[PDB]
Amino acid sequence: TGGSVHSSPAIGQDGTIYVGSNDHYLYAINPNGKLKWKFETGGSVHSSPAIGQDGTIYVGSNDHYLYAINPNGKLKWKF
């Protein structure tokens, strides 16, 4: 990555490892080690992501925002 990983990884149903980092990013990583995508946030992602029934990744950041991100990496919504 590019920042310390204080976030705890969540594992998708397809096996994808979802984790945040204090480099302002959220990383989706395949089990083989290659990166699926990364979603840039406005602050350090200290929160551990959560996965719902639809596969949406819910993670908070140090920019007052709670990000909802689709499995493909596009932003669903943000609070």
Measured distance between the N- and C-terminal CA atoms of the chain, rounded to whole angstroms: 25
4 binds Zn ion (CB under 5 A): yes
CB of 22 to Zn ion, least distance (A): 6
Instruction: Choose, by CB under 5 A, the member of 7, 16, 41, 44 that binds Zn ion.
Output: 44
Q: Yes or no: say if 17 and 76 are a contact pair by the CB < 8 Å rule.
A: no
Query: Site map for its own copies, 51-70, x if CB under 8 A?
Result: xxxx-x-xxxxxxxxx-x--
CA dihedral 47, 29, 42, 70 (to 10 degrees): -90
CB of 9 to its own copies, least distance (A): 4
